[model samples]
Target: SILDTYPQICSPNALPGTPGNLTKEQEEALLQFRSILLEKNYKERLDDSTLLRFLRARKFDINASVEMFVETERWREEYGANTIIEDYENNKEAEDKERIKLAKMYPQYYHHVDKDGRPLYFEELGGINLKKMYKITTEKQMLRNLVKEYELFATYRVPACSRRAGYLIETSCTVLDLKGISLSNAYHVLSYIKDVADISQNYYPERMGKFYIIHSPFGFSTMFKMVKPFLDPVTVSKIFILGSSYKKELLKQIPIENLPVKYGGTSVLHNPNDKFYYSDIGPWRDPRYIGPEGEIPNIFGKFTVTS
Candidate 1:
């Protein structure tokens, strides 16, 4: 009856037409893992599905899954995950306003959903002026903002998408635009990307459904070969390197109506000057903090470019 009442939640994986069908071994592993977490005083109440995420990440290796779970819990505490989540929830308006400013500087935002109903994230790395970005924001501030977004993605966006799709939507489809970047510029951002990649891969495991690197230049292949060693094989497999000729391939996965016009799609892009950029979406913040005039103060001092 429990299975019949909530078959979707009872399902072990995301396979279609499958219902409440976990193997005995897998079920026992989840129970034992939960027991271990409870004994260790981990406060987060991980459901079967959550536990199964780690289990699946480790290929059902119980010991490895438990270790990964422990590390994640430890990292959460060390990274102030609870504090960031609470701050984002309480001061979401301010956070989002700040994010809009950041987005204008570095275009990374979820615009639409893919064919699989997964939220599609777009990042125009071509728009990023690393030197200018650092002058306005510090590594610490950027890291905090990133963590806030990750928390929101994990807690809000993914779950909301899951509800809309009538199934679990655990990951995002990302398009990383590298149109204007030179080799030197690419090298300059490696440290920043490395930190972001570490957090995404290690702490936010299994969150990337697919990644498309578009407008790839000549030397990109060599650069990628160097960077490939740092990424997991599975992540590498999901990444597609495309030249300027990427629209047709991208359209196969994302509807044209849902994509931005600049990317050969029909969706309207958000303007940087729009009032909606400053207004609250799900939560409200003080109006005083909502504008270009109210940009975040550079806390770590201004960054200067060297010759």
Candidate 2:
């Protein structure tokens, strides 16, 4: 079914999807780039979709995309990405449990899907207390957890969504609830925010399908202007800033049944610790993914550095 949705790229009858509309020229460019990587003996997954992300990001400029791809692979090696993926199961279970406990203090989770079948990830900044969060976990630990989540998102969540939707789903829809945010709160986590932003924008490119900032304070615009310079235009265009009257706008992108009632939608919010909360979704896993019961399906199979 999934294969039907995504006809082989090499097939004569294959039709281009939203982000996979590679022209003949672009296809040639990609082949040339792949040859270069092969000649260099680069050992990173260079699937069509992955290469398309870089190509699209660079507007199909083969030279720029190739450079970006090579640099990304080099960064992955320097960052020890393979090692992280290999040992993640053993080390991350305990870390994830702690993160979940921290999440209870500052609400954040992937709960449901948007109208397009893109996974809906929610974060309630109102619940965050930076000092308290730091007391439980350090910045390094948070970064590690973030990387683990990113890996899981790429390896499991995206593939599982694709399997369900019968199409390749490569991005996520995000909601950042800024209800109780303040100047002090903003200042406290500014550095941490910058680090996460850099990692997402640089390393994990083209992963955010859309981002909605709801319950934004009046002063939020001023703060956002300061942060805007750090973000690229493509990312900026995908984000929507909304005030308290954001329900209708959000409902335009996400169905009322999929959104939680607190956000002026009809769906009930499930407890993060409940198994049923995730089981109803595609990539079901126990909270924190602790112990044997916590294991999730490896929909993508093994992590291959080389395709």
Candidate 3:
């Protein structure tokens, strides 16, 4: 038949019964989980992929998964999911005036895809200047910003990656560059990170493909040992902390071509005037997915940022 192109590929490790493939056990779990979701009259994206994510998170334990889902529903309401997502579709702006200024103070962004075709996020902890940052934005605003950022990823970014990779990808690979961080700086920002970390782990479960804490400072072990207990086993396992000599190891998961030149990758920004962290990049913005006409066809649905 004559139709259009929709990149078709499934993850090598993709479970036997998933979005395009479902095992009997997974089907049963999905049905059981949705039964509760229906019982609670939850109205949201109930796609196989979405439901399967929560199912996998709770190990297909229906009751546990139900509790997590209901909790997320309440969280969505608290965070103004209605307004945030609505604003995404309605209240729009071409360029952000405050974000550029903010990024200069604190560097964080999703630049390229990793070897596994997952979006790569970079955050330099040492880049923060809280003294100036406080004047530009507040903790609450940053929290909301994070919520919006995830919404963008879920809606636009990941879907684009899924198609490009010829498979479905839902997680991201992150590098938390800790070069300039100090005891005082870490202490001051610990609470903020904790807040988002809690939200990410609880509200956005199983969305972490791999996490690398690069440029880990000296004595990070003792500090890490002290704080590691507080994190979930699943979360902790995905994290890899590296000091120096990380280039080769980092190359293992991320190809040199896709990585930034600053991080041992050969990739360089096309425009010399471009800001690496803030620029509109990623497969979502690629012509392969969006096409020459510059249309974002169907990656994102109703994008509502959550708390």
Candidate 4:
């Protein structure tokens, strides 16, 4: 389920207001926060705890923390400060040069440089996605090879009991194996790691978008059988039929092996005598089915990030 405390969507009230409409206090407060965030040596304002605490600590109201954070976020968004950080990943050339220059000084990450003599990348390493999806590209073949490695890692190594953190680690390793990034950079990316139980939401995070994780053995096999849909199609085409309780009636009627991964694929024809059954219903009753429901066409289905 979506987190209740998190804003469901951007607040409409946050839209820009006319300068004249703003109260003097509001204008001054906004300027003060903006100045602190923009000044040099203050880049840490994006993630710094000290400055955040200092700003809110003066107010005795317990709710000040949330209020100040929200206001800070609003100011950042309105003034384009957030946009600057969003595009910081574009400095691939500069980041690479720094990585190489530091590699000699720090051999742990640099010892295993790529063919280009650059450090081996680790997912924890911070760098922009060559694809702009918060992923890194070592070589064309390496990218595809990394995808294949991720398939293997998720299919075998990641346990059904593993949570989002574990899933991210393994997947990130696959990317690191394919590229050469300094360890310092790898840690930067991992810091943004989010605990997402929903499989679809995993594709939304900037750091986790390139790779998909399937944590259940049954779900993994089902996704593989319908691999085309899992890769090319956006609709959910497969379901985990074994090892869990699901409504047998809501499931589509088709042979287990013949289910089409896409909406328009050929329908399966089972022997009339064989009991062809779909789950009585989707796994909507399960607490883990947290994201959108039947509304989404993709049948990638749900899996427990932590069993």
Candidate 5:
């Protein structure tokens, strides 16, 4: 075997690179891939733990994984996305204000966790207003902001929810409400929209767990085709168009307790003091769940951004 061999044991406490998470062949590729990296900076998020994702994308092939890794690094560097996190931290107050403003017109939110403990974000495509969305933030600025949200999701939200769940969490659950997805909405939605889905899958490899398309207007086969090539075949398979009867199927993946009231669950959107709309609710905020073992570095306060 041209690999470092070892038996894996999955621990109760979830941490990246923990035992039982990989096969020896995978670890071998992970070890080999990082050694020949085109890395100069951005070491924060490019650790071997994260590189495993890129490796899996390339089917655990070391050569292809390296190619994927280098291409990712190149994209981040060229797009200047390596510094988005730091920039957001610095310009948070100003940036946060603009985000909320834009969010009002766009009825999208990350409300609660799924049955699997992965974060759940719901987007109302019927509620998406392109003219209004474009007016608040320019096209390019909106594009950059989307990356910032991706970085936040990859770094802050995922870890926070992982610790909250007391198990490993990687992907997220989504429900796309398409009640008003008529012909009038299809033009601008597909143009800028296909790129949005394509770009996220491109940069973040694998983060979406499942998407339940609800209130489907007749059959939008074209929309699925538009977004499929950008995503892997495996990713495309999990997508389910539930039409109007989405509540039952959605609850199968997302627990009734954690689901939002609007969808079908009994979870509270707004607590007495906390505004769930802006609240970054997770175990990190709870003192009882706080510890060194879990995500302690990014103890993001309330009013944190969730995409």
Candidate 6:
């Protein structure tokens, strides 16, 4: 049973086959639970539930080991294969030594190993050093803070535009037509933004590769606003529309004057004429923007900011 696969993967007391443990009725219940988990997306639902439970479960004394609870809560909130790159990179020194040792001991495995002895057969790769990864994580936390603020700013104009109820906005600019925002796509884009922003802000070493660049939330919010009314119901299911034409229409609606500080919007921080895109990936190249321009305009320059 999956329960026995790991010593602490789940509750040992809830074993499926042990005598006097998990009776026939309990087994059936467990099976039903597993099936439910499989059929419905369990990880996301459980993660949210666990975090909610953790936050609301208790208020311990000042002398109590609140740190322990905090750590446990952090682990629960953060556990995932998505974090595997971070995990491995964080242990890079030890991993490097392990690889060196493995290579020396087992040349066959060593030859298949990378310079760090990370097996070639293992497809996943981590190029970052521990120190660098730490910096990335720190930067990510800062970006997350900024994102929260941006999200708040995003909602300001939303209340006024009842017609644009499902759109995405940032800094009072609608960037994404999210009427069709799926839980998965929304989370995926947000997560990518968070991660990339963090890495780009923190990992300053020239040796580190370029992080996937994303501008502020303004453009994305705009895209969501323009397209929100057309999404299919399910998170995993896709609905096709003339996203390119819609993007062009949305961009035209942004009243070029509202481009925001980062993108040379009329924000007090920057002038509209400043050419930020020459040095940085501008809002025009963002996925939200790029998607609407679609494959053809993407290949040519018809929809480029210059075009």
- Count clashing residue pairs per candidate: 0, 0, 8, 34, 1, 27
Residue by residue across 1-307, what tens digits does model 3's lDDT show?
1012433334867645446566688788898888779878886856666787787778888889888888887888888854564565463442244555676557777777888888888888787777888987899878877887777777667667877888777788998888887856665676786887788878888788889998877877767775566677878998998757788878998979878888899877776655555544578777667432233322122221110
lDDT tens digits, residue span 62-85, model 2: 788778888777777787665675
Candidate with best TM-score:
3
Write model 6 residue lDDT over 50-126, tens digit each, in one string. 22222222221211223333444354356432344344447656544433332222121100111111111111011
Candidates' lDDT values, in order?
0.65, 0.66, 0.72, 0.28, 0.64, 0.28
Q: What is the TM-score of each candidate against the true structure?
A: 0.78, 0.82, 0.86, 0.18, 0.80, 0.20
| Residue-level lDDT tens digits of model 4 in 172-206 | 21111212344334334332222111222222111
Model 1 scores a TM of 0.78
What's the CA RMSD for each of the models?
8.1, 6.7, 5.4, 20.7, 5.7, 22.9
Q: Poorest 10 consecutive residues of model 2 by lDDT?
A: 298-307
Write the candidate numbers in order of decreasing lDDT: 3, 2, 1, 5, 6, 4
Model 1 accuracy (lDDT, Cα): 0.65
Residue-wise C-alpha lDDT for candidate 5, range 145-181, written one tens digit per residue: 6787677676556555656665556677888777776
For candidate 1, what's the RMSD? 8.1
Candidate 3, clashing residue pairs? 9-166, 9-167, 17-21, 17-22, 17-23, 18-21, 85-303, 85-304
Q: Kindly provide the TM-score of model 6 when superposed on the true structure, using C-alpha atoms.
A: 0.20
Reference-based lDDT, residue 95, model 6: 40
User: Local error of candidate 2 at 75, Å?
Assistant: 2.1
lDDT of 5: 0.64
